From Swiss-Prot, chain A:
<keyword id="KW-0963">Cytoplasm</keyword>
<feature type="active site" description="Charge relay system">
    <location>
        <position position="270"/>
    </location>
</feature>
<dbReference type="GO" id="GO:0019915">
    <property type="term" value="P:lipid storage"/>
</dbReference>
<keyword id="KW-0378">Hydrolase</keyword>
<dbReference type="InterPro" id="IPR029058">
    <property type="entry name" value="AB_hydrolase_fold"/>
</dbReference>
<dbReference type="Pfam" id="PF01764">
    <property type="entry name" value="Lipase_3"/>
</dbReference>
<dbReference type="GO" id="GO:0008970">
    <property type="term" value="F:phospholipase A1 activity"/>
</dbReference>
<dbReference type="GO" id="GO:0046340">
    <property type="term" value="P:diacylglycerol catabolic process"/>
</dbReference>
<feature type="active site" description="Acyl-ester intermediate">
    <location>
        <position position="204"/>
    </location>
</feature>
<comment type="similarity">
    <text>Belongs to the AB hydrolase superfamily. Lipase family.</text>
</comment>
<dbReference type="GO" id="GO:0052651">
    <property type="term" value="P:monoacylglycerol catabolic process"/>
</dbReference>
<protein>
    <recommendedName>
        <fullName>Phospholipase A1-IIgamma</fullName>
        <ecNumber>3.1.1.-</ecNumber>
    </recommendedName>
</protein>
<keyword id="KW-0175">Coiled coil</keyword>
<feature type="active site" description="Charge relay system">
    <location>
        <position position="307"/>
    </location>
</feature>
<feature type="coiled-coil region">
    <location>
        <begin position="175"/>
        <end position="195"/>
    </location>
</feature>
<dbReference type="InterPro" id="IPR002921">
    <property type="entry name" value="Fungal_lipase-type"/>
</dbReference>
<comment type="function">
    <text>Acylhydrolase that catalyzes the hydrolysis of 1,3-diacylglycerol (1,3-DAG) and 1-monoacylglycerol (1-MAG) at the sn-1 position. High activity toward 1,3-DAG and 1-MAG, but low activity toward 1,2-diacylglycerol (1,2-DAG) and 1-lysophosphatidylcholine (1-LPC), and no activity toward phosphatidylcholine (PC), monogalactosyldiacylglycerol (MGDG), digalactosyldiacylglycerol (DGDG), triacylglycerol (TAG) and 2-monoacylglycerol (2-MAG). May be involved in the negative regulation of seedling establishment by inhibiting the breakdown, beta-oxidation and mobilization of seed storage oils.</text>
</comment>
Amino acid sequence: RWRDLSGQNHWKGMLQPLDQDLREYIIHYGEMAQAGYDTFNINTESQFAGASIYSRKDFFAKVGLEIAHPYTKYKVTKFIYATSDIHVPESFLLFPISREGWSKESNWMGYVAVTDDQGTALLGRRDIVVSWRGSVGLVNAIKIFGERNDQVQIHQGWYSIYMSQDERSPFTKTNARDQVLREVGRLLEKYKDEEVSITICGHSLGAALATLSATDIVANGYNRPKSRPDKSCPVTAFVFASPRVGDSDFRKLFSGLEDIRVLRTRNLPDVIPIYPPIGYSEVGDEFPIDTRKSPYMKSPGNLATFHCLEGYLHGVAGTQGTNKADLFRLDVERAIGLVNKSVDGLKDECMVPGKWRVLKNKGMAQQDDGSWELVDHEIDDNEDLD
Amino acid sequence: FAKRWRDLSGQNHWKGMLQPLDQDLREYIIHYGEMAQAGYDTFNINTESQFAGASIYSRKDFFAKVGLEIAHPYTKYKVTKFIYATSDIHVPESFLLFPISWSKESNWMGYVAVTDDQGTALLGRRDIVVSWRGSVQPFEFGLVNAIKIFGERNDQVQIHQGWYSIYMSQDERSPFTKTNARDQVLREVGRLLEKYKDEEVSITICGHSLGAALATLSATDIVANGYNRPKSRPDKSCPVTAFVFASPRVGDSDFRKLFSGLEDIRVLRTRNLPDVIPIYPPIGYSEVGDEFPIDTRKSPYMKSPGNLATFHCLEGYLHGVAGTQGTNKADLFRLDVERAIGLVNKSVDGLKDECMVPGKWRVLKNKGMAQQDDGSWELVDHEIDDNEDL
C-alpha cells in the first residue's frame, strides 16, 4: 500500500476516519523529524550548542528508534548544516554563549538517510529520507525556481536558512539546499535500477524547510538520477505544525506538479500554522487533529503544549476525528511519556516528570584520569560514505 | 594516611595542621567531604517522581555509582545500611522532601559503611563511616530538652528542635522509620564494632548543612552514651571523629559543656567565611569542636559576586579545601590536589561563566525516563534494595 500511504491519491478516504496503516505511517515519519530534536544540542553553556550530540553511526538506536521499531531500518548517510545571512530567532539558530564554540554561524539542521536492504523490503521500496530539524517579509525566489517561475515568493526566513552560506565555514561553505541536493543525487544514482521514493519530514521550522525543499526538488527535476533523466520518483513531505512558506504563485507552481505530495498535519489549538497570517498561501493536503480531545493532555494547554511534536504524535496515535462528539483512543502502542520530552504537557495526574530529555549529567562525564569533562558530542567528520 | 591517621582524625585537635594546611589533611578532609556529597548524589529531589525523597542507587557498588571509584584509591568502603528519617513536626522541604502526588513521611537520610580489607590497610585501621544526608532544594525552631538522648545526668543540655525531631522521630506505620534515625545508626554501628572488636577501629561521621548538625549530634550521642565500644568489649572505646561542613549550630551552652568534657570525641568544622548558614541560629546556641576557616571568594574559578547557594554548596566547600592557602587578604589560592573544578556545578551555576561548565548539571539521563524492551517508556529512577541487614 506504500504509494497510497505516500499520498498517490491525496489520502482521499484515508483521513476521516483515519486509516490504521496511515496512522502508523504518519507517526513513523514524524518520529524521523523528532529524532532531529533528540540529537540537537540546545545547551548554550556548551561549546557544542547548535551541533548534533550523536554521530551518524547507529544514529537511530541512539535516539531510541530501534527497540520496538521494526520499520525504522535506515542508515543515516549525511548530516546537514545551515546558516543565515540575516538575523533569526534563537529557535532557528542557536549558538554557544561563548560566541567561540564549534561554529560561529552554523547549526546542525538535519540529516539524509536511506533504507537498508531490510527496511527496503519492509517499506516496499528504497526510501530516501531527508529530515529537517525544527524549532527549538517575502522575497523573490528565482534563484530557486528559475526565470520560468519568477513570480514565486518565499518567506525571507525560510529562504535565508535554506540558501545562505558561510564562506569561512567547513560546514556551510555550501548552503543547506545544495548539501541535500547532492546527497539525494548520490542516493538516486546508486539505486537507479530500483524502485525508489523520497520522503521529506519536518516540524515547525523543519516543516517549512521540508515543504520548500520538496517543491524545489520536484520543480527543478532533482527527483531523477542524473544517469536516468527519464525516471522520476515520488516525492512526499510529511509535515507537522507547518507555518506558511510562500505566496499565491508558490501555490500555483506547487499545484501544477505531478510528482509532489504534502500531508500537513495540523493541531487545531496550535496557532503557529496560521503564521504569517497575511500574504501567504498553504500548499498540500491537510490533516486536522485536536490534542485537547486527549484525556492525557493537561487542560488548559499553552503555546508550547499545543505546538510540541510529541504532542502531535500523541494526537495522531489516538485521534478519532476532531468533532466535539468524536472519540479519542490510542490505536497504536505509543508511550504517553514521550509527550514530556520538552514540555510539562501531560496532566500532572500522569506522574510523568516534565521536560525530561537530557544527557546524563548534561554530558558531564568522569574520565579515566579522574577529571570531569563535558562530553556532549560524538566525533563525526561527516565525510561522504563509500 | 595509614601512619598519621590518628592525628589526621584529630587526636591532637589538628594543632599546627590547619594554618598552613597540612597536605595529607587536605586530602583527608576532601575524602570525608566526598562521603557526604555522595549523599546528595544519591538523593532523588524530583518531586514529580513517586520516588522523591528516596535513594536513586542501591547499596551494591554504591561508591562506583556516585563516581567515587575512578581515581579514588582510598575510597574502598562497603555500604552496609541505608538510614531513613522522619519528623513529628513540620520542617522545610530542604529537610524532608515528598512526591507531589514510596513514603508519606520518611526520607533516605544517609548511610553507614565500613572499609573493606584493602581500605583498612589503606586507612591504617577499620574505619566505620556514618554519613548524614544534607540540605536540599530551596518555623523558627526553638530549643528542646534532650534528656531522652543524653540521660538525666545531662538534664540541662538543649538541642535545636529541628535537629532533634529529625534525629528522634518515628512513623509507626512505616517500614522505613518505625525506629528513628538515631536507633538505626546505633544498631548498625553496634554490629560493625562487634564484628571487628579484635582489631583497631575508628568511627568517622560526616555531613554538610543539615547533615552537619546531624553528624555533630550523633557523634556526641555516641561518645556520651558510650556507644563507641563493642557490647562484648565495654573496655575498648574507639575514637569518634566528625568531619562537618557548613555546620549550623546544634545545642546550647550545656551541650557545649557536655561536649567539652568528652575524651574520645573530635569535630572539625570547616566553615566558608562568606557562607551565613553556620551563623544560624544566631541566638542561644553554642558551637562545638575545632574550626577550619576557608574562603571560596579567594578562588579565581568561582563566580563573583557569589550568592547564598554558591557560598553554601558542598562542592564549593571542597573546591575551597582543595586550593585554600589561608583566608587572609594576601594569602594565595592554588589547587594542591587534582580536583576537577566542574564538580562545583553539580547543584549551582557557581563557576565563572568563563569556565564554560554548564550550571546545575547533576541529573540522571532523561531524568530517569527509560525505554523498555517492549518499547514502553517508564520512570526508572530507583534501584531495588530491601535494605536488609547484610
